[PDB]
């Protein structure tokens, strides 16, 4: 679960202290973060996902109190006003077409001083028409980029995953947060640590290009 996600420690480090907080998890999946937050003292956790079957597995995994799971479409998201101290989302917002609308919804749902911490696929990773590694004449591993400044839907994971992602530059994402009422708190283009690479050698290639953008914003 979380211990398998290379970017979890970096994203976890960006979170506020979760003890006593009211938290919403946007695109909670099996509820790995929901359970982590509850284990670390969250007063209340609302986990939202489109899949009823996945929410059924999340409920079954426990605990009996403090975590509520509800079916929701992040493209048509509604949240009660002034009801959360923290909004979290792992690798969901790159599938939302009107992300600015979602940001405004999260902003009104957060109490003053609350945070929104989320991960998305990095635009370097999402940009290319034919994403993948290239090995140059010298044997060096490279990541060819095209159309980085041409924003819009990308169908490069449509065949493999059945998803359309929305390519937006780092500036576009941050400007949308700012226009929505957030102050940018921390921005990280994920890089595994040398210790992570020693434990998981396959992470060495992640030094060449970022797969993920991690952002913390405050209202």
Residues near its own copies (CB under 8 A):
124, 128-130, 134, 136, 140-150, 169-171, 174-175, 178, 183-189, 191, 206-210, 214
Minimum Å gap between C-beta 180 and its own copies is: 13
Q: How far is the CB of 129 from its own copies (least distance, A)?
A: 7
Contact status, residue 16 vs residue 110, Cβ threshold 8 Å: no
Nearest-angstrom CA–CA distance, 89 and 106: 11
139 or 162: CB nearest its own copies = 139
**For residues 157 and 189, which CB has a smaller minimum distance to its own copies in the complex?**
189
Q: How far apart are CA 118 and CA 74, in angstroms?
A: 14
* Smaller CB separation from its own copies, 61 or 100: 100
Provide the CA 65 distance to its chain's centre, in angstroms: 25
Q: Looking at beta carbons only, is 163 or 178 nearer to its own copies? A: 178
* 8 Å CB contact between 113 and 206: no
Q: Which DSSP string do the residues of 35-104 spell out, in sequence order?
A: HHHHHTT-SEEEEEES-HHHHHHHHHTS-SSSEEEEE--GGG----TT-EEEEEEES-GGG-S-HHHHHH
Task: Please say which residue, 52 or 146, places its beta carbon nearer to its own copies.
Answer: 146
Query: What is the smallest separation between the CB atom of 201 and its own copies, expressed in angstroms?
Result: 16
The CB-of-210 to its own copies minimum distance in angstroms stands at: 6
- Closest distance of CB 216 from its own copies, Å: 10
> Given its phi and psi angles, is residue 91 left (phi above 0), alpha (psi -120 to 50 degrees) or beta?
left
């Amino acid at each position: 679960g979380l211990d398998g996600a290379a970017e979890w420690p970096a994203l976890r480090a960006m979170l506020p202290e979760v003890g006593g907080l009211r938290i919403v998890d946007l695109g909670c999946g099996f509820g790995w973060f929901c359970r982590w937050a509850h284990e670390h003292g969250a007063s209340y956790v609302l986990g939202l996902d489109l899949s009823e079957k996945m929410l059924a597995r999340a409920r079954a995994a426990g605990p009996d109190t403090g975590i509520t799971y509800e079916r929701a479409d992040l493209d048509k998201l509604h949240l009660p006003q002034d009801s959360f101290d923290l909004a979290y989302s792992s690798l969901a917002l790159h599938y939302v077409e009107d992300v600015a609308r979602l940001f405004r919804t999260v902003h009104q749902a957060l109490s003053p001083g609350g945070h929104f911490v989320f991960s998305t696929e990095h635009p370097i990773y999402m940009a290319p028409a034919r994403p993948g590694w290239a090995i140059d004449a010298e044997g060096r591993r490279t990541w060819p980029i095209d159309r980085y400044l041409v924003e819009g839907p990308r169908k490069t994971d449509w065949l493999a995953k059945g998803v359309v992602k929305h390519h937006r530059t780092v500036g576009t994402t941050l400007n949308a947060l700012i226009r929505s009422g957030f102050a940018i708190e921390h921005v990280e283009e994920f890089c595994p640590t040398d210790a992570q690479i020693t434990a998981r050698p396959e992470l060495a290639e992640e030094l060449d290009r970022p797969m993920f953008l991690l952002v913390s914003a405050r209202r």
